[PDB]
Amino acid sequence: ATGDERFYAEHLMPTLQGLLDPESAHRLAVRFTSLGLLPRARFQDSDMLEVRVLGHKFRNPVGIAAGFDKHGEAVDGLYKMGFGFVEIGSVTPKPQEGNPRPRVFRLPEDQAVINRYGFNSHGLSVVEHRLRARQQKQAKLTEDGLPLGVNLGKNKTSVDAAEDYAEGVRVLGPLADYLVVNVSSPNTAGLRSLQGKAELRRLLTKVLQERDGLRRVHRPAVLVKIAPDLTSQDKEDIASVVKELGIDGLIVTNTTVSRPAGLQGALRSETGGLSGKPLRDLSTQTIREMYALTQGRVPIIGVGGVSSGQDALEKIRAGASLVQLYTALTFWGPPVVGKVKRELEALLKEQGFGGVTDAIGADHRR
């Protein structure tokens, strides 16, 4: 049940959201997290939540998705919250402002958010120095089952997308357990076209060459993060390229540019990517498809609308080895992490799984 879950979800978060504009709230959340001003994460991770994937041990399979800690300011606070892994970014090569404010919108009636941040980023150099300041602390955390992902973007005005990603691999690759080639932001003109077969093969060949050129101890896994809005053709092409090139994994999915029938929020027709509950099943179905297309041989990090243990287990059974959440944190606060983990453990036991690993892709074997 938990007292603070109820307190954060029913009282504290909705009260604070009533007082603070969305981006002000985001900024305050990053600040509070970075300072460790967080409730006591009392959930002890059980052995049945441990997952071995991407050349690493993950103490639990619940991560924070990209876009919360864009500039790597709150990594340690996020582990304190009870996340099994942290992904920072997206980070662009040069600093850039992103879109004019306002650029984030709450849809409380839908338990959703729409954002059009447009890759606001401190840039590679700032983030590099921030990560270097805690590099050995991270090495110990990783060893202890708490890996770090770095999500790479491209600048708005760059004339060579592949070179932007290559720069990211060179600069932040040595500080990351895994890198994410984010070709699925809905908020950068032309970006999602990099998901097309020919463009993706060329781009990923260059990214993988740059990764392979790093020293062994500094050589991260490379994942591609994909949209929920892809055609069947697009998904077939991505699966083919992933297998051809030996891409280490997929992150499924980014936000949607669709607006599902039934959205109630006043701000439903704002431009941007939609996240949270209305994305959940679209993301789950995309995980399911990508798992089948890759014959279950390519690790998937499942993301989109995870707010409960059931949501997490649905993505795991569809083929995810790990899951992430973001929007649920914005509505329910830090206790949501312990909630998801406790519920997930209980459901695994109820469905006769020895642990998370046993449940990965279970629906495909029914």
Ligand SMILES: Cc1cc2nc3c(=O)[nH]c(=O)nc-3n(C[C@H](O)[C@H](O)[C@H](O)COP(=O)(O)O)c2cc1C
């Ligand atoms: C405000 C906001 C900013 C985001 N920024 C990024 C980003 O910089 N890079 C990225 O790959 N995904 C970004 N995302 C997408 C999330 O990583 C995630 O894929 C998506 O929100 C679905 O998960 P959720 O429903 O749990 O939020 C962002 C999402 C939100 C809501």
Ligand SMILES: CC(=O)O[C@@H](C)/C(C)=C/CC/C(C)=C/Cc1c(O)c(Cl)c(C)c(C=O)c1O
């Ligand atoms: C769990 C959390 O997000 O932050 C904790 C540390 C907290 C007590 C934050 C206070 C400020 C609030 C109410 C933040 C909620 C919120 C939001 O309301 C919105 Cl709209 C966004 C985009 C974010 C992005 O992180 C967001 O955190």
Ligand SMILES: O=C(O)c1cc(=O)[nH]c(=O)[nH]1
């Ligand atoms: O910076 C953003 O606008 C952004 C990037 C991304 O990958 N996904 C998203 O929803 N927003």
